[PDB]
């Protein structure tokens, strides 16, 4: 009769994110006349750190084309960049590390981070620490290019989508063990109120579909349908298969 734990994460009372000491959205600068037709020069000032993100950031000062003003962007730091480096951003930008330029002009098989899934959306895909995407298959008629996401799933996107050349810094992070319960606590204190996950088998029949019984057992099959209602989707939600995995994934 009582609501379950994942149902209470949608109201967002204590399950809202911890966003105070974060710096801002890490977004490419918006497209205008300079990047549709040419390039523009910017210099990165400092490599900073977000709490709760695994990647670092790069704050880059550009020269405003229309007002006399220097205005600061925040980029996802591509790996290998340093402070006091010139960063070039445009259609006619030259393909180096850290330069951001449209995916339709760059060749096939170049490694891409922080790319747009619809044009002008200022960077959505392939942004976690150490991740990247690969471009193949330019279709210069009905201009669409297909990329390869970090999940191995390919996606045909628009050609004028914009993207910084390189891989996201801070990679190899998940190779280290958390190694004790204390350093997992500090990990999620930067992120959310989510960390000590009680098993639903351990709680009571008000609190979960799996709890109860004189023995800790699930009882009911732990693969459930996708059109199950809220408060019943717990466990392996619309699982195509179970058991320890064989092969690679063998389902497109």
């Amino acid at each position: 009769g009582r609501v379950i734990r994942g149902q209470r994460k949608g109201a967002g009372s204590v399950f809202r994110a911890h966003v105070k000491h974060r710096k801002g959205a890490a977004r490419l600068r918006a497209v205008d006349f300079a990047e549709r037709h040419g390039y523009i020069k910017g210099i990165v000032k400092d490599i900073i750190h977000d709490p709760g993100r695994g990647a670092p950031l790069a704050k880059v000062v550009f020269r405003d084309p229309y007002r006399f003003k220097k205005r600061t962007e925040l980029f996802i730091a591509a790996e290998g960049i340093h402070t006091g480096q010139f960063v070039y951003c445009g259609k006619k930008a030259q393909l180096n590390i850290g330069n951001v330029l449209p995916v339709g002009t760059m060749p096939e098989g170049t490694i891409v981070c922080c790319l747009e899934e619809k044009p002008g959306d200022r960077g959505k895909l392939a942004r976690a620490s150490g991740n990247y995407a690969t471009v193949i298959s330019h279709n210069p008629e009905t201009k669409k290019t297909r990329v390869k996401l970090p999940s191995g799933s390919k996606k045909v996107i628009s050609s004028a989508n914009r993207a910084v050349v390189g891989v996201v810094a801070g990679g190899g992070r998940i190779d280290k063990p958390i190694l004790k319960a204390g350093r997992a606590y500090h990990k999620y204190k930067a992120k959310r109120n989510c960390w000590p996950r009680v098993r639903g088998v351990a709680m009571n029949p008000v609190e979960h579909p799996f709890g109860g019984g004189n023995h800790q057992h699930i009882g009911k099959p732990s693969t459930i349908r996708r059109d199950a209602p809220a408060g019943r989707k717990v466990g392996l939600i619309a699982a195509r298969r179970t058991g320890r995995l064989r092969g690679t994934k063998t389902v497109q």
Partner: peptide, 9 residues
Amino acid sequence: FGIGQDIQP
């Protein structure tokens, strides 16, 4: 007044 030069009028 090209791209990457003086402020556009």
